[PDB]
RNA sequence: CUAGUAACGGCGAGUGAAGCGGCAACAGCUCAAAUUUGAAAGCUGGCUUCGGCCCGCGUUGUAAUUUGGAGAGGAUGCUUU
């Protein structure tokens, strides 16, 4: 769903844990991409998101928690896929450091 | 030099086993009532493979016609390495 | 030349090297 | 949790139990040498040699499966191409 | 040390000198019977580590299976089926394992390794004489190769939980109403 | 049986034993 | 592209003195046979019977 | 006092018997069972061949006592013994 | 004061007297009761000086009186630079636990890697190590290191030298501080070795020199004989130059143990009388050797670089160095003094393969004179084939060939002057042609820019 | 027993295990990857007075040794048939 909202961006899947997380910086070089949004699965039921500018741009991880899709009929809207968003932040997102570095990436 | 390497090869056959069975009937007599090493030609594929990985092999003669030919695909870089 | 008498004479990359927030060792590629 | 005072232990002989010897590093360049490449090995030696190292790694991801068996194939076949001029 | 070699070399089975083998053999197999025998192991190596010895008493079958679906799959293995026909034209022989020696666009080419359970070589032998009991009749009827094995889940762990005693067992067992006496 | 097994079996067979109480 | 190549000895071309076995070498490979030695023996008792 | 802080040391009392284990108002069976256990046994002693104690016996008339000599003697010792071998297999024949 | 009146346990004082020593040499008077009340102490004493058997027989005290056993682990730790000086400490140390049921091992450069882990695995208490795999094993082999009680560092200067620094940082970090007995030995007192000891050491010493002030290093009186030998002929060399200059007084070097033992089998089956002396033998055998050479007219011993640096050379007519020598400072000026021996015409040579011709220009840098030594090509007696014949038929004599063979090439490699001598240059082929065989036998002669995006470990636990 | 638990589902009907714990019974092993190479030492036949003769199989590998919480090789000194 999020990179059908991103046509800047392509996908991978089936890599490996056991790989080291600077390995991640030779993937997104090899392909030319100075981000990655990586999503990393633990027990097969919990997602941590890292947002990362590859060659040296700070990193974040977060804890995903309570998912929605599209798949889900309940939801009852759509939008031109690769349109422009409008991105809206928070009043909190301003002030805050830790969050104003967040909303750069 | 086919014939002069069997010429040399010949000489050094391997016993069969009547001359083997009278050879060690020689020695069980002689004991009722001194010798040095054997040289042979040695042969068998991991015997001989055996041989030239340890360089204790001379000279090594590989038939044309194997009809698994993989088992001596490998000996001709084997012996040149 | 040989300046000391017996002993053994004596006998690249690609990032910048600078320090980070905590005083100590960073990289730029 | 409970402390209890922790013992060494006798080394594991099923400890790497690939292969790691001298010998069978002999055997599998060796048989590399004899047996030539594969046709996706190939091409991929071409682009080694042309300097298209992202089309090769890029290729071998295809073809294998994962990237780090990308990654060990070309590294494999680069140090092919290296050794092979060094006889050369 | 030469099957160390042939083991190698039967990783690499892509390569130029290898490919050119399964070649011209795909092409001998094709025009020869469906069921037909072998006098020696075509991959010696791989008919060693599988069990195969030169003593008399073991023979050598190569059989050719057609490829493909049963957009429903057959669950039997081509290997298996492989196995069946064998000991279907040799019936008083024992299926000993098989493995794979040629492959091709319709047809899919397997090694089978018997063994005669009637002959005196093979009742003397104490490593072999296990398959001169009446117990181990067509094994590969029963899924008692390596390839039934497989195909059976007869694994451990969590993620063979329902087939690693047989899955017809675990259902009986997991849908018996076991009432006792003083209950 | 085996040379391997007769060889282990002539040395070290089953003993016969008692445990006092 | 040239279909079929040639091979270049990247391995072969060089060639190295010692053996691959650094295993001790048994004493067998230096004295008379064991194996023999029992073999002459069984034949000395079937002659010593008749 | 102890040292060293191993347990086994507090339950104590390279190489160990292998085929037996060396042991340091009452049922009548176990009396019984205890008495067969200690009676003496036969030792059943093992001699050498008769080749055996001829090759010694032609190694010592040659040499003598010096049993350096006899192991780096080829002729009468061709399955190259060591000395220290060769010195307790002369000791179970008597010849010192 | 003497060996008895020290009070040592009956299994000490038993395997003392089994070597005849009585009489303490200076540096083992007074420094073996200050170890034995657990006082550490620095020694600067030379090698030599009976200062081997200073640092074991507090060591082995210890040992028996807190009752070591193998599943204890290494109780002593003895840091040795080279491999021959740990294999002379490892042939005392087995003379003094002749009577003791503790455990001696060795840790050598070039030995089995994975077989001296199961070594150490089954429980070895004293250990003789060289620093190199020591750390190697401290830092990768499951082994108890956990009840070290004594650390000897033997010849800490040499140490330093050859160049084992991070080792040695390493070493002091990852074994045991508390309560632990340490001795530090050497023989110059430089910058680097006092690093050594304010880190090493407990903060109050107990120092002692007796260090040879009388160097009388000598730069022009003295000459150094060379002979330029092919790699497969330097045995003929040394057979047909004894056999030739037989009824005289020669003195052979060689560089290890294991080579002294193979030429001596080798010597007597080709028929030349010759003594031997090395560290397999007997300590009593040892001296009677010696004895028996210095009071002979003529004859030959065969005797290490490292077990003759404590021994007075008698008035000898040739010193022959048929190996590298250990310390070429130690070569150049005493032995070449040794070789002159007070009023007697001797001379002391070198044998030189045509790769080691960068040692004469180390020796024109020092500006001390040399005399070429030639051969005629019908003076080399030619064995080699019955040389060949007999190793290939007898097998001890096979397998101390291939001893001899193998210490000789893992000494080539751990030598100090890397630029004259080291193996890259050696033709194998020919170095086995001149121990015997018709192949070489196998050896281990070796026995920037990163990831895109990897910075440094801030943390985390690592094995 | 866990347990109608976890998990899956027109989340309705429903479906539905396992580790742990208490018992019953318990027993471990054979190969392939090694050069016996100072000696294919292995095995099927069918001819016999049966005591031992040939034929074949087999070196593209039949015996012995060894099967990775191992093992081999030397040395070593006790203990086993």
Request: glycine fraction near 6%; charge should be positive; aromatic fraction near 8%.
């Amino acid at each position: 769903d999020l990179a059908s909202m991103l046509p800047h961006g392509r996908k991978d899947a089936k890599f490996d844990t056991k790989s080291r997380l600077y390995e991640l910086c030779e993937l997104a070089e090899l392909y030319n991409c100075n981000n990655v949004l990586f999503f990393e699965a633990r027990k097969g039921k919990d997602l941590y998101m890292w947002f990362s500018k590859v060659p040296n741009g700070p990193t974040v991880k977060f804890y995903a928690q309570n998912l929605h899709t599209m798949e889900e009929l309940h939801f009852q809207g759509n939008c031109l896929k690769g349109s422009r968003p409008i991105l809206s932040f928070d009043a909190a997102f301003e002030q805050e450091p830790y969050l104003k570095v967040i909303k750069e990436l | 030099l086919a014939a002069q390497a069997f010429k040399l090869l010949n000489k050094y056959r391997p016993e069969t086993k009547q001359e083997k069975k009278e050879r060690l009937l020689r020695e069980a007599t002689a004991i009722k009532e001194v010798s040095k090493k054997p040289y042979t030609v040695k042969y068998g594929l991991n015997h001989v493979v055996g041989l030239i990985e340890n360089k204790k092999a001379s000279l090594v003669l590989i038939a044309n016609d194997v009809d698994p030919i993989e088992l001596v695909v490998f000996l001709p870089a084997l012996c040149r390495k | 030349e040989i300046l000391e008498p017996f002993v053994d004479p004596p006998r690249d990359r690609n990032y910048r090297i600078e320090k980070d927030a905590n005083g100590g060792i960073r990289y730029v590629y | 949790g409970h402390k209890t005072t922790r013992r060494v232990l006798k080394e594991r002989p099923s400890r790497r139990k690939g292969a790691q010897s001298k010998r069978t590093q002999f055997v599998r360049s060796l048989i590399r040498e004899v047996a030539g490449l594969a046709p996706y090995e190939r091409r991929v030696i071409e682009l080694l040699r042309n300097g298209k190292d992202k089309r090769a790694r890029k290729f071998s991801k295809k073809k294998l499966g994962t990237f780090g068996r990308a990654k060990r194939k070309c590294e494999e076949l680069q140090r092919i191409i290296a050794e092979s001029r060094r006889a050369h | 040390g030469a099957l160390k070699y042939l083991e190698e070399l039967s990783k690499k089975k892509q390569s130029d000198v290898v490919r050119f083998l399964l070649r011209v053999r795909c092409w001998e197999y094709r025009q020869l019977n469906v069921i037909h025998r072998a006098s020696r192991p075509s991959r010696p190596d791989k008919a060693r580590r599988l069990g195969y010895k030169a003593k008399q008493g073991y023979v050598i079958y190569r059989v050719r299976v057609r490829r493909g679906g049963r957009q429903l799959k057959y669950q039997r293995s081509l290997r298996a089926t492989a196995e069946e026909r064998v000991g279907r034209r040799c019936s008083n022989l024992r299926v000993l394992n098989s493995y794979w020696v040629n492959q091709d666009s319709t047809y899919k080419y397997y090694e089978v390794i018997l063994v005669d359970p009637n002959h005196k070589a093979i009742r003397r032998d104490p490593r072999i004489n296990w398959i001169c009991n009446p117990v181990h009749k067509h094994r590969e009827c029963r899924g008692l190769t390596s390839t039934g094995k497989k195909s059976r889940g007869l694994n451990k762990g969590h993620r063979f939980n329902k087939t690693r005693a047989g899955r017809r067992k675990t259902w009986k067992r997991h849908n018996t109403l076991s009432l006792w006496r003083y209950r | 049986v085996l040379e391997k097994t007769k060889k282990r079996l002539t040395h070290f067979p089953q003993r016969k034993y008692a445990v006092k109480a | 592209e040239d279909p079929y190549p040639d091979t270049v000895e990247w391995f072969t071309s060089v060639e190295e003195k010692m053996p691959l076995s650094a295993a001790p070498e048994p004493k067998r490979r230096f004295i008379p046979s064991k194996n023999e030695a029992k073999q002459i023996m069984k034949l000395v008792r079937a002659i010593r019977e008749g | 006092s102890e040292s060293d802080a191993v347990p086994q040391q507090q339950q104590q009392e390279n190489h160990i018997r292998q085929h037996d284990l060396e042991l340091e108002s009452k049922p009548e069976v176990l009396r019984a069972l205890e008495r067969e256990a200690t009676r003496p046994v036969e030792k059943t002693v093992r001699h050498q061949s008769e080749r055996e104690r001829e090759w010694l016996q032609r190694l010592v008339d040659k040499h003598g006592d010096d049993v350096a000599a006899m192991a780096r003697d080829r002729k009468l010792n061709p399955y190259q013994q060591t000395a220290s071998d060769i010195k307790r297999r002369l000791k179970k024949a008597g010849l010192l | 004061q003497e060996f008895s009146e020290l009070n040592l346990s009956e299994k000490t004082t038993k395997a003392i007297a089994e070597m005849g020593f009585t009489k303490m040499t200076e540096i083992q008077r007074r420094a073996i009761p200050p170890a034995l009340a657990g006082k550490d102490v620095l020694g600067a004493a030379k090698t030599g000086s009976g200062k081997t058997l200073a640092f074991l027989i507090p060591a082995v005290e210890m040992l028996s009186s807190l009752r070591f056993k193998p599943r204890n682990g290494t109780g002593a730790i003895v840091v040795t630079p080279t491999r021959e000086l740990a294999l002379q400490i490892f042939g005392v140390a087995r003379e003094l636990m002749k009577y003791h049921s503790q455990t001696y091992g060795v840790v050598i450069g070039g030995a089995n890697r994975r077989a001296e882990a199961e070594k150490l695995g089954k429980g070895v208490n004293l250990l003789i190590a060289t620093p190199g795999r020591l750390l190697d094993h401290l830092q990768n082999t499951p082994f108890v290191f956990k009840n070290l009680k004594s650390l000897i560092i033997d010849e800490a200067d040499r140490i330093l030298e050859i160049g084992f620094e991070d080792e040695m940082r390493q070493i002091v970090k990852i074994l045991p501080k508390e309560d632990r007995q340490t001795m530090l030995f050497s023989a110059t007192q430089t910058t680097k070795v006092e690093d050594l000891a304010r880190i090493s050491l407990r903060p109050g010493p107990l120092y002692i020199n007796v260090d040879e002030e009388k160097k009388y290093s000598t730069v022009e009186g003295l000459e150094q004989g060379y002979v330029v030998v092919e790699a497969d002929k330097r045995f003929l060399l040394l057979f047909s130059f004894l056999k030739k200059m037989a009824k005289k007084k020669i003195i052979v070097f060689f560089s290890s143990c294991n080579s002294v033992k193979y030429y001596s089998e080798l010597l007597q089956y080709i028929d030349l009388p010759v003594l031997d002396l090395h560290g397999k033998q007997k300590q009593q055998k040892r001296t009677n050797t010696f004895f028996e050479f210095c009071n002979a007219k003529s004859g030959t011993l065969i005797c290490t670089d490292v077990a003759a640096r404590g021994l007075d050379i008698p008035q000898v007519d040739w010193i022959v160095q048929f190996d590298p020598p250990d310390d070429p400072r130690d070569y150049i000026h005493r032995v070449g003094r040794t070789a002159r021996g007070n009023n007697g015409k001797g001379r002391s040579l070198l044998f030189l393969q045509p790769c080691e011709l960068g040692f004469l220009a180390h020796l024109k840098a020092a500006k001390v004179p040399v005399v070429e030594y030639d051969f005629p090509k019908n003076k080399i007696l030619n064995v080699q084939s019955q040389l060949e014949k007999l190793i290939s038929t007898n097998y001890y004599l096979n397998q101390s060939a291939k001893e001899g063979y193998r210490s000789y090439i893992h000494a080539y490699a751990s030598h100090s002057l890397r630029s004259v001598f080291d193996v890259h240059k050696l033709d194998l082929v020919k170095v086995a042609k001149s121990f015997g065989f018709s192949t070489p036998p196998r050896v281990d002669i070796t026995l920037g820019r990163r990831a895109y995006g990897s910075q440094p470990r801030q943390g985390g636990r690592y094995k």
